[PDB]
Amino acid sequence: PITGLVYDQRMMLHHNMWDSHHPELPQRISRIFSRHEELRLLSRCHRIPARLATEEELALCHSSKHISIIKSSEHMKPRDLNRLGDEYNSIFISNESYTCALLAAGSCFNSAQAILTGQVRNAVAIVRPPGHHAEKDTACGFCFFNTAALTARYAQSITRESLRVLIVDWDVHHGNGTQHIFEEDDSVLYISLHRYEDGAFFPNSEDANYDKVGLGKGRGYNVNIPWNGGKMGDPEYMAAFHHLVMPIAREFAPELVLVSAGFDAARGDPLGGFQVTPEGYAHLTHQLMSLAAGRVLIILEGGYNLTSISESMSMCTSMLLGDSPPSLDHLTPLKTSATVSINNVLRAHAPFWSSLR
Ligand SMILES: CC(C)(C)c1cn(Cc2ccc(C(=O)NNC(=O)C(F)F)s2)nn1
Ligand SMILES: [K+]
Ligand SMILES: [K+]
Ligand SMILES: [Zn+2]
């Protein structure tokens, strides 16, 4: 059983020319990679080559206009970059941003291909910029193209259109883009855990609430787990997996699992305010590995404490490699509002998932 790993240092070239200390740093990915080396995890993986996504592949999820505008940034002058970036919610652009986004996506496609052709069992993709906020027609939240959504459609394109893909988004932020892209789709089950705060937390939309269950044939295939009023950590996430994520996933029977693996819910993150531990992320990963005959791709999203994300993601890879799960700390009583969140979701989804009744 082989675990693949993809990483290319050229994804570091995407940078913030006005604010060089912006938390979506180049070194997010070099740090994670270094920690894999340090722990001797790298040498235990098969290295999967990065490549650029093609414009045709982008069109799996994104409009020509969007692709064209971001493509054009490659040749923009500083003023054009700053103004274009400022047309979006929370975006910075440099001349290398487009190519970096292509590299992130194409890295994940190669990884999905390696999994689906049986060359590896599972894989980790250490990529930036992130993807899950990226919409069909717009950039958002440090994301240009929706890497994970693209990877799902890429997987369908090399297997069959109806290949069942579960996307579990444990980044602390709602994947607005991923929700929307698959909102009318029953082939792609989207499950997101996220800090919501009654819509006050980025990206600040009630779309992230538990009552958005999907539209049309996608009804029941969008699962939002919003957290409110609580510094959520390993007990709340373990409870959500037990009561919601795993029961729904098992019943869906995915053929491929993608993890929108942000590590901004991690203890010490400067933005998330949460306290999931490296060991917590290992248990989450271990649980997902029981799905899809173990066909799991972990895709880096957000996460801004360089130490926290390095420890947390390297622990995930350790789980993929088949190492036994570390012990969790003492699971404090589940926080109250978390029970309330889990109950709301149970009631929203019991109509669609018999395992919930
Ligand atoms: C530069 C500072 C720190 C002032 C700042 C805060 N925010 C708010 C946000 C916009 C987007 C965010 C986010 O989504 N983070 N994690 C992701 O999943 C992303 F990587 F995809 S937090 N903007 N700028
Ligand atoms: K999420
Ligand atoms: K869906
Ligand atoms: Zn995030």
Residue numbers in the entry: 442 to 798
Task: Give the original sentences from the paper that presented this experimental model.
Over the last few years, difluoromethyl-1,3,4-oxadiazole (DFMO) derivatives have emerged as a new promising class of highly selective, non-hydroxamic HDAC6 inhibitor. The inhibition mechanism involves the formation of a difluoroacetylhydrazide (DFAcH), which is generated in situ by the HDAC6-catalyzed hydrolysis of the DFMO warhead.
It should be noticed that this compound features a five-membered ring (thiophene) directly bound to the DFMO, a moiety that could induce different electronic effects on the ZBG and lead to a different binding geometry in the catalytic pocket, compared to the phenyl ring of ITF5924 (see section “X-Ray studies”). Moreover, the smaller cap-term of ITF7209 reduces the interaction with the binding site rim, which may minimize the potential impact of the ligand on the protein conformation. In this work, we report a new complex between zHDAC6-CD2 and the ITF7209 derivative, which is a novel DFMO displaying a previously unseen binding mode. The CHF2 moiety lies in the flat pocket mainly originated by Pro571, which is buried in a local interaction network between the fluorine atoms and the closest residues. Lastly, Tyr745 exhibits a possible halogen bond (d = 2.37 Å) with the fluorinated methyl substructure and a hydrogen bond (d = 2.51 Å) with N4.
